[PDB]
Design a protein around this nucleic acid. Sequence first.
RNA 1: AAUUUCUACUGUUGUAGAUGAGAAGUCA
DNA 2: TGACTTCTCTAACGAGCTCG
DNA 3: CGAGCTCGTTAGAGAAG
Length: 1280
Amino acid sequence: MSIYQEFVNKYSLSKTLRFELIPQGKTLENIKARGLILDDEKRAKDYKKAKQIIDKYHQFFIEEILSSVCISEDLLQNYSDVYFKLKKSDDDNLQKDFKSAKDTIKKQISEYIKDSEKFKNLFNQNLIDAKKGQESDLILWLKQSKDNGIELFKANSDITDIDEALEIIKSFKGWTTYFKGFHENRKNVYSSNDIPTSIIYRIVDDNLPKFLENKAKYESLKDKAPEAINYEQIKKDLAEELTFDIDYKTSEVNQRVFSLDEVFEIANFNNYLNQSGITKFNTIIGGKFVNGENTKRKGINEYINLYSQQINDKTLKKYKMSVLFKQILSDTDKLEDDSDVVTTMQSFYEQIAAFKTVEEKSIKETLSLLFDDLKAQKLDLSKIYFKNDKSLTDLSQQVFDDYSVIGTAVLEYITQQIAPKNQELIAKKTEKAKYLSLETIKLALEEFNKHRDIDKQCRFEEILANFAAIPMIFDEIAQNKDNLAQISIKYQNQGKKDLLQASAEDDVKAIKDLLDQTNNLLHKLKIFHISQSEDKANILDKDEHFYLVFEECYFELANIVPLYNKIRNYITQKPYSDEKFKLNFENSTLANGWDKNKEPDNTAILFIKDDKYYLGVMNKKNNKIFDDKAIKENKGEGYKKIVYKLLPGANKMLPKVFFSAKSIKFYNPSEDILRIRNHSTHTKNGSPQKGYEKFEFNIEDCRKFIDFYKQSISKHPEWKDFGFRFSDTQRYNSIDEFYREVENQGYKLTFENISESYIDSVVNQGKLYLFQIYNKDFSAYSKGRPNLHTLYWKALFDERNLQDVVYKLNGEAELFYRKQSIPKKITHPAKEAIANKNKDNPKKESVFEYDLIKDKRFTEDKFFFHCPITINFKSSGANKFNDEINLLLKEKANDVHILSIDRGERHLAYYTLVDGKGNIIKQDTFNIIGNDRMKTNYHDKLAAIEKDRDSARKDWKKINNIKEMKEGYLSQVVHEIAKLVIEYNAIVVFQDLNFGFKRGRFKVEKQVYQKLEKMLIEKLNYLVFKDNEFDKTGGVLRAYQLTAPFETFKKMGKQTGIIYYVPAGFTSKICPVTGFVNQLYPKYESVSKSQEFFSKFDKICYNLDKGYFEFSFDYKNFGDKAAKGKWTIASFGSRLINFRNSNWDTREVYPTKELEKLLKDYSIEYGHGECIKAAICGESDKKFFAKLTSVLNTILQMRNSKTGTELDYLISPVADVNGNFFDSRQAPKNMPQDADANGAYHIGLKGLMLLGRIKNNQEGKKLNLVIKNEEYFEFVQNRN
RNA sequence: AAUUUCUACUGUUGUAGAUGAGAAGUCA
DNA sequence: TGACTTCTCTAACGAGCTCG
DNA sequence: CGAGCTCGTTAGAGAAG
């Protein structure tokens, strides 16, 4: 029987059921008449015009907290010393010191911000509404905008001036419940974490590493060039700009021209860093544009362009000075129309190309001159770095025709340079190091050429020539701008979406190409650019001339990845607008509690006429319909208005009502009890109120202070309806678990009848707006299975729920409304034969008596109802969930038949039920989805869309209509994974995407396979089966909670519940029977160096009766230690070889017939029947050894597509213990069948040894769930 | 080619499966 | 480029307000 | 300014590895 009987109703989560309202009776006629929904646009669309007001005031607060901060020089001298140690000498134990050196400067400001006076009333209610004596801070500044005559609008923003903004900001009087995600996603702007958009993460990582860099290029400038910077001219010329009102070390209030000898001081760090101080610093260092003289009076960086120009020294051009970047939330829009689909692009290629710079070098010539200055080795090669991730692999792709030739040369040269006989430092100098210099690259490429002939060289000059193939890409952009200027005169229309239709295919493919040769252009400069990453915080001895001109042409060119995603998210949408908004019935309280006592203001209540469900929203002004005297007066039959009783919090309510100004006399205790609440002695560790202090808990308190609550609850007027069943008060350890005694039992839901004729008349009177929630299950024309957001709603109100409560209703439901997006167009009229679209369905015809408008749910207005509920409310929460599982299946480990999912070359997954020994019980593909009614082949449905016999092969409309259908496949297949893990009650084991993941070209990408393990963790955390009994396990309330929730992809680790994780390195290229891995990689390193490598083979011999040659090897005679054992690989069957398609598509080559040819071509004899050891090693030729490697580039290839997309079977070199060779044309059911069946059976074998560790668990709860290749390659081979 | 929304649908005024919503700095 | 925060998941009371 | 009147305060567990 299923072992997961225990894993039922375990923890709590809150899904939100959504519905459509039906305006019934005369509900909609009163709404349109009084102007209700038309005056709802002005406070559900218009707050986006108020989110332009709040952030601008949130920008004025930046200007008046950073010009009001004064940080010490003690934490700048503790920064700048470590800031210059790591440049000249980077190490490990100073990174812990550098982080703590910058931790208490990003926290010392983070405690100054949270202790100001404009901050506590800015992320809460009181930002926008005024107190009776305290007028709020938004309305003061907009009046202060008039108090000084400032003209903040009609020059920068959308609103005319502040006078209409004075009207707009008073449209949110009691409406403070809007901004609660707009005021939660701006607590990251003042967050002390490492998130990359703040003002305290930025002034420690974007200007403080740039200002202290720019001080070393000023102390090393006055001694090396005294005459250069004319001090006496910049005092007179820019005297108005240099009026810095405050100094640091003297705290002057002297509005005077500062001295340039002291503005570059480390102590003077606080004279800037608002929006108007970085402007002042970048006025001197970049020049001041004043067009009153028709010339530029350019500052100190013009003096470097005069002093080093005359005497002609390019070492003072190393000492140029940089530009500080502009602060986050400066003064600087998602796309929906087509009037601005072109001028968000044609007004960018005017900005990225047609602009005159400061020093007069156009951006075509900047990458032209600098890469030509790098061409003949002029710049220093030990200061320009490569990004050491697999983006440098792409730099080896375009010119070296190999992926890992650079990453091996910086592993081969560093091997001989430091530890030439391999032991500790050898990894992090070239592998874990985030950057490698060109001097390290050049001394690794003119060393590998010394051990290689003329045919296969690897020249450093080709990398310099590859970068010279960059600066003429800007010339064909200047040719495409002559092509893409005839389209901007064709789209002058405002909102019509004729660039999204399928007729202009010849005008969208002129845009994807132009946004692809400016998106690999940024992916070839990506290997240069410095990263401000974490755990290394990358700082090295950088170049002084390269990385100042490169930042001119990267961070101005980097504004295309937030612009390429503004088009590919515009073309790949659907032709209707899902722009909905919430409607409120002239009330800031729509569904907040649903409670019976608090519903003249919660405004809403539900109904049931014994089959379907309704919503009744009372009109807020005349809401006197159900004030407890018209229910008994109108009792009868019909609707079944609920009384809903809720008690949120046994921390927040039970001291609020039992120690109030009213009910304190009704439950009168002695002063023995009153000393507890004052000093907070009942709490183990909490918070007393003002007046007293915290004391120590004793066991006498919370076995009698709870008894105060038992007499207080049992005499309450409206809190006797719950019927509490509290346990024995001696068995109460704390009040945190007496919370859980009050909170779950403080919830009842029973029914009271109302005569149907009254509340059919009050909707006719116009006081009860009545609505019906429905789906395709709550209509009368259905018989099949419901949805899951309708099988939950029918369990909020069932009687078997309310016995032992599971589905709790929550407050703050939210009513939404959606306008008319697309017009009504009947695409399938009545009595017309329509075409089938399934290649297995017999009934090819389709004639409908009723019409079908194309997706008509976006043609007519829909009132919505988004209703959060709570699942398993009575039970506990989620603490140490995955540790409970491993401590449970230890006595149930011999019931667990491990399921295992992979990616796919030909398939999409190959889920495989591996047994404990390893014999596959039931494997099947994941291309055929469904029960015997209809069957759908998503493999064939991909293969007709996936860039196959389609229009133009490159447009964005394909590559998401693959992906959304591929994502819609992920919505399908998670049910067919869930059915297996209950029928075969085991586990899921995916492939992790942290480290150790598969690399090749698959259908399922890296992107759309982490979502299939994201959409499985949120459909195995709460798992309901639509065809199971209600009160039985696996049903609706007694359902499957087997995993934990989803926090991040990083926090999945090796285990997040029943879904384990294993690596995905070397699982698809292994013989399943014996465990061979091709670790003896042939690459044709040299002619003579291969000769001792063929003697590292034990014997290259032949057998008479066997009839096949063999390359016997053992791994003890060569490095990169992976496994052991005498192999004697064979040359039995045929191996296909892939080729460059386009003709030269596919041809078959036999290994043995090639070995018969290529060995009889020279004088080597074989036919005696013994070893050919010395004969193969004795031969010396260029062509011979460059061709025998192509035999070993074929005898070890274990994937072979038979023709174009037919089938790829599996072959095995290494023998069994009998003599037979594994061949998947005759493989049994307990062995893999296809090529993707071998990439899934080893993901289970590497997952089955997780379960070997877990069944042998001990008292040490430090379960080594990590996999090393020495552990896996030993387990898979000798398991029998 | 119909849906609380999404994907494929004819599975027939809808069938099989998924659905956590308002939110939204945006790393790159 | 697809994920990075962590909450509100609420009833009752003391409050100045037409009214008494 | 008590009639109670629609508001904007306000009461303040112990999990979180």
